[PDB]
Design an enzyme around this catalytic site. Structure first.
Site, PDB file in Angstrom:
ATOM      1  N   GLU A  55      51.586  61.024  38.253  1.00 31.48           N
ATOM      2  CA  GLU A  55      51.996  61.414  36.884  1.00 31.48           C
ATOM      3  C   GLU A  55      51.408  60.305  36.015  1.00 31.48           C
ATOM      4  O   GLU A  55      50.501  60.553  35.448  1.00 31.48           O
ATOM      5  CB  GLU A  55      53.375  61.313  36.888  1.00 31.48           C
ATOM      6  CG  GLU A  55      54.021  61.891  35.448  1.00 31.48           C
ATOM      7  CD  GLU A  55      55.540  61.788  35.329  1.00 31.48           C
ATOM      8  OE1 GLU A  55      55.868  61.730  34.237  1.00 31.48           O
ATOM      9  OE2 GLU A  55      56.488  61.606  36.347  1.00 31.48           O
ATOM     10  N   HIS A  74      56.077  54.506  40.686  1.00 36.79           N
ATOM     11  CA  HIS A  74      55.912  55.863  40.135  1.00 36.79           C
ATOM     12  C   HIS A  74      55.959  55.539  38.533  1.00 36.79           C
ATOM     13  O   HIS A  74      56.403  54.312  38.000  1.00 36.79           O
ATOM     14  CB  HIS A  74      56.811  56.688  40.355  1.00 36.79           C
ATOM     15  CG  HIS A  74      56.427  58.392  40.111  1.00 36.79           C
ATOM     16  ND1 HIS A  74      56.908  58.893  39.101  1.00 36.79           N
ATOM     17  CD2 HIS A  74      55.201  59.013  40.429  1.00 36.79           C
ATOM     18  CE1 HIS A  74      56.225  60.232  39.018  1.00 36.79           C
ATOM     19  NE2 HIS A  74      55.175  60.220  40.013  1.00 36.79           N
ATOM     20  N   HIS A 110      62.968  44.784  49.407  1.00 40.81           N
ATOM     21  CA  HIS A 110      63.644  46.306  49.997  1.00 40.81           C
ATOM     22  C   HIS A 110      64.325  47.057  49.219  1.00 40.81           C
ATOM     23  O   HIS A 110      65.146  46.483  48.579  1.00 40.81           O
ATOM     24  CB  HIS A 110      64.295  45.799  51.433  1.00 40.81           C
ATOM     25  CG  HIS A 110      63.802  44.638  52.225  1.00 40.81           C
ATOM     26  ND1 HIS A 110      62.607  44.889  53.237  1.00 40.81           N
ATOM     27  CD2 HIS A 110      64.053  43.429  52.478  1.00 40.81           C
ATOM     28  CE1 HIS A 110      62.282  43.916  53.999  1.00 40.81           C
ATOM     29  NE2 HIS A 110      63.326  43.142  53.320  1.00 40.81           N
ATOM     30  N   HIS A 115      59.147  51.369  37.881  1.00 39.53           N
ATOM     31  CA  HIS A 115      58.810  52.694  37.260  1.00 39.53           C
ATOM     32  C   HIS A 115      58.209  52.284  36.052  1.00 39.53           C
ATOM     33  O   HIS A 115      58.835  51.905  35.008  1.00 39.53           O
ATOM     34  CB  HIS A 115      60.021  53.553  37.149  1.00 39.53           C
ATOM     35  CG  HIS A 115      59.751  54.864  36.850  1.00 39.53           C
ATOM     36  ND1 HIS A 115      59.091  55.668  35.819  1.00 39.53           N
ATOM     37  CD2 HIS A 115      59.793  56.013  37.933  1.00 39.53           C
ATOM     38  CE1 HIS A 115      59.059  56.889  35.927  1.00 39.53           C
ATOM     39  NE2 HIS A 115      59.260  57.081  37.345  1.00 39.53           N
TER      40      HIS A 115
HETATM   41 ZN   LIG Z   1      58.751  58.749  38.167  1.00 39.06          ZN
HETATM   42 ZN   LIG Z   2      63.387  41.173  54.019  1.00 38.82          ZN
END
Ligand SMILES: [Zn+2]
Ligand SMILES: [Zn+2]
Ligand SMILES: [Zn+2]
Lengths: 206, 206, 206
Positions: A55, A74, A110, A115
């Site tokens: 995108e 993203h 993690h 974004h």
């Molecule tokens: Zn997105």
């Molecule tokens: Zn770790």
């Protein structure tokens, strides 16, 4: 390498773009890397990470950074229906334009998410389950686990305490400073070392 | 079984370690299990879970526990550059040392994360999107969804309300007690039954 | 299509159920779709999403909706040990019963989770890392990133500010209203357009 893929043709993207991944980076077989992505040296991309530049694009991950399990990169579209750049959806760094810019020696721990539009400065720790969106995180910063930066600029050298969701620039300007006695002050250096060594070790078995 | 893998040689890990997984456990094809991991009987490991024992190790998942979609298990390194154990990065349970210890009849619900050093006691529910890090969760506990335990010991039989991030031991000591009329009091027993039956059913088609 | 699978036989599910996925939907190779699932037209299912209809079922994803990276759909069992429906674990929508019902033009953004019993009404944005559980989200709603709805009904046309965890119906009834000048007022329309075009583009390369 089914998991490293071109992005598709769309109304905002008229040609497929293929990731550029340095040979010293390691992409886990169950990580996914799609589209106009650049990944620098020694970058460890862990299982279930998804870097998707289809995108908003481009997405850049600098040398010696790491993208840990379940991290998502993203970005919002950078090209209008008219084909004009959406300036509010790009970030400029060193005179270049990115949808997402991850600097050098950055840990994306993690289940965190960056974004676009967004930039993360060098030597910054983005903690587990943290969130960065429409934000510029300075260098030498620490986002503790479950913290978030939305719509703000985090000054260089600050930290966000665990669980705190920063949406106000006035609050961002007031964030506490990293000092030598801060509990997370030396964590990013440690995590970066580990992940460089993991990338080297995983590549030797590949 | 490409998704069940040895960990790599690193400066803190001089030989590859391979997961030990009981035959009655089910590992989804899109789950990932790496390194010095022990998984007990009837354990259901759902899609997109990542159990990665390549930095801190070992990681132990006890009998009849479950590791649901997108759950991450990882741990801070347990061996120094000098090769000495980092005591603050291990947890002792029943006279043995672990990076992450998950007890018996424990549910790790969708998108939760347990990051070593950490222990979770028997019959405890770790709710969806919850987070456990540098913490000891007692037995018979309930972490409601979006709750977190960072740097604390949760007494046996307590719950953390949804969204609450516990970083202070004084707060942990004050957490409310599970009682028969508490809304989550019987949830873990139900979830454990379901996941044992899922593991059995998935294995019969394998 | 190893990633599109029947659910297993269990004590609550005596026959395997296979997903029904419209030909114009795109399922990423590293997404997972299991069991009694219906996916409508033009639905984009991104990498690392897990739609798992093996405990509570059915799970329905309506036309032109999207399921982004790392999103989890799962549900509490709908059938008792006696074989009777657990009414509190199903939602009725248009005279039909579902474990999870996702309406039309709904965005489930990166790392969000909808856990049954739950319904999300048409044209609603479920933001990044948001959480929906035992809840009915109205149509034309916006859950900002990191927001959550647990055990409540969100009225049509409301939004939940970033980071807010709504567990009380009195609080849900008081949530602010979407207006034309609200920052997220037009986001879902944009995201839905993008993901329809992504599904089309990805399918042309398949
Ligand atoms: Zn997105
Ligand atoms: Zn770790
Ligand atoms: Zn579930």
């Amino acid at each position: 390498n089914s998991n490293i893929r071109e992005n598709p043709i769309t109304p905002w993207n008229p040609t497929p773009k293929k990731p550029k991944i340095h040979p010293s980076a390691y992409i886990d077989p169950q990580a996914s890397v799609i589209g106009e992505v650049t990944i620098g040296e020694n970058v460890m991309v862990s299982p279930m990470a998804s870097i998707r530049s289809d995108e908003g694009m481009p997405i850049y991950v600098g040398d010696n950074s790491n993208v840990q399990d379940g991290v998502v990169l993203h970005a919002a579209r950078t090209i209008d229906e008219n084909g004009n750049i959406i300036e509010d959806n790009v970030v400029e760094v060193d005179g270049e334009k990115f949808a997402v810019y991850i600097g050098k020696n950055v840990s994306l721990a993690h289940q965190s998410q960056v974004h676009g539009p967004a930039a993360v400065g060098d030597n910054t720790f983005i903690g587990m389950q943290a969130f960065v969106f429409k934000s510029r995180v300075g260098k030498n910063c620490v986002l503790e686990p479950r913290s978030a930066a939305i719509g703000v600029t985090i000054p260089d050298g600050r930290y966000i305490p665990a669980g705190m969701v920063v949406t106000s620039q006035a609050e961002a300007d007031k964030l506490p400073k990293v000092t030598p006695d801060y509990a997370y002050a030396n964590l990013n250096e440690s995590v970066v070392k580990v992940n460089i060594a993991l990338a080297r070790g995983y590549l030797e078995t590949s």
